[PDB]
Write a protein that binds this ligand. Sequence first.
Ligand SMILES: Nc1ncnc2c1ncn2[C@@H]1O[C@H](COP(=O)(O)OP(=O)(O)O)[C@@H](O)[C@H]1O
Ligand SMILES: O=C(O)C1C=C(O)[C@@H](O)[C@H](O)C1
Ligand SMILES: [Cl-]
Ligand SMILES: [Cl-]
Ligand SMILES: [Mg+2]
Length: 165
Amino acid sequence: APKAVLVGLPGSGKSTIGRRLAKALGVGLLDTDVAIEQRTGRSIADIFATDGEQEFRRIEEDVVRAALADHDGVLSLGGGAVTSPGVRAALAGHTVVYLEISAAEGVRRTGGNTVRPLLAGPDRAEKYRALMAKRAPLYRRVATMRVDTNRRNPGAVVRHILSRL
Ligand SMILES: Nc1ncnc2c1ncn2[C@@H]1O[C@H](COP(=O)(O)OP(=O)(O)O)[C@@H](O)[C@H]1O
Ligand SMILES: O=C(O)C1C=C(O)[C@@H](O)[C@H](O)C1
Ligand SMILES: [Cl-]
Ligand SMILES: [Cl-]
Ligand SMILES: [Mg+2]
């Protein structure tokens, strides 16, 4: 079981806080997206391209179940994983840190468009708020710890999580 499972919208800091929290804890980081494309040689985006969310999520939920079981480090859940009820069920009892980010800051951190398909450019701010409106309640469902990453620099979010694990 992971030291901590990180959930949040794109830009909330999963990959970042994950890497830093993993390092701090001396443990490894496991990003389910990477765990997904590695295990498939075919990229997340391109995966969707060929088989769509219905399939992606099936693959994703299965890697998550796996990571939740065999990973003792820090696990960063790909943003939409929470939408799969089986991902939510798999999460129960685990240490789930919901990295909270406002839509304004969130739209801005992901400003570079470092992938994030559902977050395509044409009217991203609107897109991100809708996305936040939909995923937000779910992250709050599965979260055992909510961390506001809005003001806090990465180090402080990480120390905040450490201080609380
Ligand atoms: N607390 C933070 N303060 C400032 N920038 C952050 C913070 N958390 C993450 N970032 C930055 O925002 C960008 C998105 O972070 P990332 O970890 O890739 O998000 P996610 O994987 O959750 O989608 C990264 O450049 C990262 O450096
Ligand atoms: O918020 C989301 O649905 C997504 C979050 C990331 O994990 C991407 O890899 C997924 O493809 C999409
Ligand atoms: Cl299981
Ligand atoms: Cl994501
Ligand atoms: Mg990520």
